[PDB]
Design a protein around this ligand. Structure first.
Ligand code: BJA
Ligand code: NAG
Ligand code: NA
Ligand code: NA
Lengths: 11, 251, 28
């Protein structure tokens, strides 16, 4: 149910 | 948080969400103690009985949040972890004694109306305020009931409980590095932390200097908001020498 | 920090939140 966060923060 | 209420905007600007990268989900609460350091419960990161052992690259820290699930554009800030430090004498085998961990951020977070650190107590503030009957405040995005989930950050005020009552409420061996809080059955009012609130702060507002101090970390409890049970919190002051040692050596 | 524990939207502007008085009242 979480909104996707900006791709820049992901790894 | 069970039987709490919606937080006000900016009410707990030190509240941190520990967020799992994949799958994306809430892992725990935590608190901001400086521009580069975040405090949480060790069991949020390491708990072998449940096959839990997170490393730095598994997680993100989300600071300035109010909504549990939304990406709060222009308000929240998301930070990567440089390194995790778990108390070397964290007792996950027995009773969660010394349930504390620090996380150093890769980059300093900018403070704002929604992002601001909490104070850690000195001996005197701890002595003055950690007394049975004195109330603190717990916040988090954890479960609303033992067995759903909140739209926004929840808050509840709870009284510290006398140590013999804490001890008599459980078969677990309680230590000086824990305290408990919550209402007694006879007192009527209720409320408690729950699953997902782990790692979040138990804070008290000093009447001497009007500053908020983090006295506890949400650690453990037998169910949530059960009559005759109490929430247990890591005693932050008792472990402050370790906190300072880590920050001094690695900060 | 020198400014730790003072919230921008509360203490810094001398506004109280809706339940902090409950805490103060318990500090007897
Ligand atoms: N063994 C005995 N007899 N007692 C100790 C039990 C410790 C354990 N209790 S538990 O009921 O499993 C906690 C729980 C898990 C899921 C949903 C609700 C509540 C517990 O709290 N644990 C086991 C390891 C991690 C920690 C935890 O889940 N912490 C999160 C937490 C849960 C509840 C509270 C609360 N204040 N009620 C606080 C933190
Ligand atoms: C947990 O992860 C670390 C690092 O990958 C590892 O060294 C350790 O042995 C693992 N198990 C623990 C700490 O119980
Ligand atoms: Na007991
Ligand atoms: Na209870």
């Amino acid at each position: 149910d979480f909104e996707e966060i900006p791709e820049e923060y992901l790894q | 948080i069970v039987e709490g209420s919606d937080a006000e905007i900016g009410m707990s600007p030190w509240q941190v969400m520990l967020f799992r990268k994949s799958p994306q989900e809430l892992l725990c609460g935590a608190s901001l103690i400086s521009d580069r350091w975040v405090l949480t419960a060790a069991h949020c990161l390491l708990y072998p009985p449940w096959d839990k052992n997170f490393t730095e690259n598994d997680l993100l820290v989300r600071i300035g949040k109010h909504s549990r699930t939304r990406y709060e554009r222009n308000i929240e800030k998301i930070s990567m972890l440089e390194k995790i430090y778990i108390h070397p004498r964290y007792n996950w085998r027995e009773n969660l004694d010394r349930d504390i961990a620090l996380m150093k951020l890769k980059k300093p977070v900018a403070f704002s109306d929604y992002i601001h650190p909490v104070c850690l107590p000195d001996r005197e503030t701890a002595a003055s305020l950690l007394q049975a009957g004195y109330k603190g405040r717990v916040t988090g995005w954890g479960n609303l009931k033992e067995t759903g989930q909140p739209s926004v950050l929840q808050v509840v005020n709870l009284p510290i409980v006398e140590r013999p009552v804490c001890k008599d409420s459980t078969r677990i061996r309680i230590t000086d590095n824990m305290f408990c809080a919550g209402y007694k059955p006879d007192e009527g009012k209720r409320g408690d932390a729950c699953e997902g609130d782990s790692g979040g702060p138990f804070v008290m507002k000093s009447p001497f200097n009007n500053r908020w101090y983090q006295m506890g970390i949400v650690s453990w409890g037998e169910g949530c908001d059960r009559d005759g049970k109490y929430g247990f919190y890591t005693h932050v002051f008792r472990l402050k020498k370790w906190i300072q040692k880590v920050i001094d050596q690695f900060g | 920090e020198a400014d730790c524990g003072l919230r921008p939207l509360f203490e810094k502007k001398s506004l109280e939140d809706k339940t902090e008085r409950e805490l103060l009242e318990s500090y007897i």
